Amino acid sequence: IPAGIIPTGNVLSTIEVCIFF
Amino acid sequence: ARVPADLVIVGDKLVFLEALERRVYQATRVAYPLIGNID
Amino acid sequence: VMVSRITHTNTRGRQVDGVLVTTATLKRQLLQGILQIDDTAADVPVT
Amino acid sequence: RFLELGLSVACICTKFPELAYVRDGVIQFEVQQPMIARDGPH
Amino acid sequence: PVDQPVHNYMVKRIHKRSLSAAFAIASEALSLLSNTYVAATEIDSSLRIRAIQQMARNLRTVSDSFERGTADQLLGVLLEKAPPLSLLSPINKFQPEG
């Protein structure tokens, strides 16, 4: 696979909120 | 490169003061050295 | 006798009045808590 | 003001207009175990 | 006329270490990696970037695990190369000529 992106550099993952309906 | 790292002059010479315990040996399966004990 | 043309001064410009010579044990013993540091560098002639 | 108080640093205030209709919410975190890389091929 | 110079010739052993780590790839993961080699209008971009994101994250964890462990190794050999103060200091002090 090609990377095609920057080699991370301190990955800050995303906070996702899941609301129930 | 400017890095935040504390340092102390002791006597006539200047030395880093490191307690590298939080960056490494936190949440891992290897025991920290320098705790050898005595008899 | 205060004879000089260019003498040994500190970084600010005040001339020193002599040299004190000992061994490093007593150097560290006076340096730790007895006497205070005035400066680290000094001005010295070249001839 | 709550923000200019020194206690405000312990909270991360954020707006949410559609909160009165919230029944329920979850959030997730995926912090992983950090490992050392010991020399021997074990 | 009793003064002659002397030169010292010490040599050092190079020694030899290494570092090793494990890194696992699932069957679904590698099977999707195979299609991304021929990435085109086919092979969906969202799942492709999800795959490369997760695998690059894991690859960087195993990559800087070496970077973490280097400090452990060097501190360990520093402990292996040290005598006590309470041993060396009277030896260094109370010995005028030998």
Automatic annotation (TrEMBL), chain E:
The chain holds residues 123 to 220 of 1396 of the full protein. This is Major capsid protein.
